[PDB]
Amino acid sequence: IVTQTMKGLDIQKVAGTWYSLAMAASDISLLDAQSAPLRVYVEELKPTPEGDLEILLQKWENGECAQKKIIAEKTKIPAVFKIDALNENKVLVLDTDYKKYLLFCMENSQSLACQCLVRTPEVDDEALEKFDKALKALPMHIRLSFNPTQLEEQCHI
């Protein structure tokens, strides 16, 4: 479904701290519950020297905020990774300036969730504008965004 990818991505330059400032999904149920399946809060990206992507994140699971570590394997397209898990979910990098914001989507095989990542616990109105413009014609039915207080809490409580 997603046909916005970042050209010239240098995955090594996405390394480090990020915050999930906003999230949106195709289907309400993907983000609706607190333990909704795609309601995930990015902590750190750790690219490997081979160009795969180790992802640290938190998720609400079984009534608490759980730490996850997920591996997204590279493909022939630099902006597209495949999660080493049940149905091979695709991670697409739409857009990034490495130093402030990163937009990404995840999709299966037809469900979709996208996020606006930022480097700091601040509302970045220009990153959110780029996020909303990217989503404009994706078929999203739920959107969440977080305040700075929430961005500094586990699972954005």
| Binding interface with ligand SDS (CB under 6 A) | 14, 40, 42, 45, 55, 59, 68, 70, 83, 85, 91, 93, 104, 106
Nearest to 37 by CA among 77, 89, 82, 75: 89
Residue (44 or 152) nearer to ligand SDS, CB: 44
- Nearest residue (beta carbon) to ligand SDS: 68
Q: What is the longest distance spanned by two Cα atoms in the chain?
A: 41
Residue (25 or 42) nearer to ligand SDS, CB: 42
Shortest distance in whole angstroms from residue 40 CB to ligand SDS: 5
Shortest distance in whole angstroms from residue 29 CB to ligand SDS: 14
Shortest distance in whole angstroms from residue 71 CB to ligand SDS: 10
Nearest to 50 by CA among 72, 28, 31: 72
Shortest distance in whole angstroms from residue 106 CB to ligand SDS: 5
Residue (91 or 118) nearer to ligand SDS, CB: 91
Can you tell me the distance from the alpha carbon of 145 to that of 121, in angstroms, rounded to the nearest whole number? 12
Residues 6+ apart with CB under 8 A from 105: 2, 91, 92, 94, 112, 113, 114, 115, 138
25, 38 Cβ separation under 8 angstroms:
yes
